[model samples]
Target: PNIEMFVVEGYSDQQKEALVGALTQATVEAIGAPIDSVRVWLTEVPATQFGIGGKTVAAIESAADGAPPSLSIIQVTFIAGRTELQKERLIAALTDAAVDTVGIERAE
Candidate 1:
């Protein structure tokens, strides 16, 4: 299993470790796989590097008075041929873990 965590810049080393651990544990629980088999890659993108509705995150956040649009995206790649139930569990587990570990609302 391969996990890609793309987040808007700001997290520290401690946060990264926590993110990786949460993600790895989630995958293992979802797939009944060894913890060592999961691989995680963390990528941080600057606010100016990504946008929503053609507006950069920096611009949107500065203009909005409410909760800003989520800037975190996680992409998971797994071996082919997993069952539907397994896939569903994986998605659920990942979403829950991300929200719990990073304190962000889920979108998409």
Candidate 2:
């Protein structure tokens, strides 16, 4: 099983590492996956390329606010047919992984 995270460009390297570690740990707890087998990949998207509310991210905020909020563009692929409870837990756990590490409150 694997997770792919698409993040906006601008966070620190340590923050990225924290995200990866938390995500892998969450997968282990919620999905019972081995740490070695749980793979997480993160890609960075430039603000100029990401759009929200029809405006490019680069066009959205001012220098006053600095970096945008943390998170999104997540893809998690699990082994075939996990238990319903595990799958549900995995969902919340993964969302929580980001919430704590990246400072987001919730996932959609």
Candidate 3:
């Protein structure tokens, strides 16, 4: 088991739906090895309590350019553990991100 987060703003319901589709395609095309070996997850991030401090899309883009880590990631917040839909979205995003990396396989 693993944990990941994604912070998204300025997206409408329609945009979110489109994003899911794009991300899903990104996942499949990004897959290099067998799909069964990989597991991807994603969770929706809510706005801050005070509605401040999280990265905006433009902010993300600026920071992402020279990120120390090889891969860029988004940080999101959930109400608690996670809803079924949240889990699926997160998995897909993270897995797709992973596939964009070195290898797509079990860690050990």
Candidate 4:
């Protein structure tokens, strides 16, 4: 697959949003795939988050190693009140990256 996923912590929703845009594009290029095949998965978790079921770090490392994934699970934090514009931009960016799939999702 050309797409992949990620779960990062110590990052706010806003920061994760922007970073996803950059990182998705970069990952696609990194794996030598069309930009249209890229996707990202950003999850929110407590700051104390770490190794757990689903193995987020392992998944990210796989993508880093050119093993594109069909889905990525990421842990992150969100701004108390990020603007809709920010959310819209993120959705657009994710849409672009996903091309045929939804790039990002919220973790309950």
lDDT of 2 at 63: 12
In model 1, state the lDDT of residue 15.
Answer: 65
Model 2 lDDT tens row, 7-97: 5677677666766675666556644567888676666779998666688878871110111122422332222112221332343233322
For 12-106, candidate 3 gives per-residue lDDT tens digits of 56655544454333333332223343233334554442123565434330000011212322321111112323333443333323221222123
Q: All candidates' lDDT scores?
A: 0.47, 0.47, 0.31, 0.38
User: Which residue ranges in model 3 land beyond 4 Å of their true spot?
Assistant: 1-5, 32-42, 49-108
* Between candidates 1 and 3, the lDDT winner: 1
Least well predicted 10-residue stretch by lDDT in candidate 4: 76-85
Per-residue lDDT for 1-108 in model 1, tens only?
556656667667866676667666655664556777767676677999867779887886111011113542333212211231233234323333222122223346
Clashes of each: 0, 0, 10, 8
User: lDDT: which is higher, 2 or 3?
Assistant: 2
**Candidate 1: residue 29 lDDT (0-100):** 62
Better of 3 and 4 by lDDT: 4
Rank by TM-score, highest first: 2, 1, 4, 3
Question: Which regions of candidate 2 are displaced past 4 Å?
Answer: 61-108
- Winner on lDDT (1 vs 4): 1
lDDT of 4 at 92: 30
- Sorted on lDDT, best first, the list reads 1, 2, 4, 3
**Model 4 regions lying over 4 Å from their true place:** 1-10, 48-108
Each model's TM-score? 0.55, 0.56, 0.32, 0.36
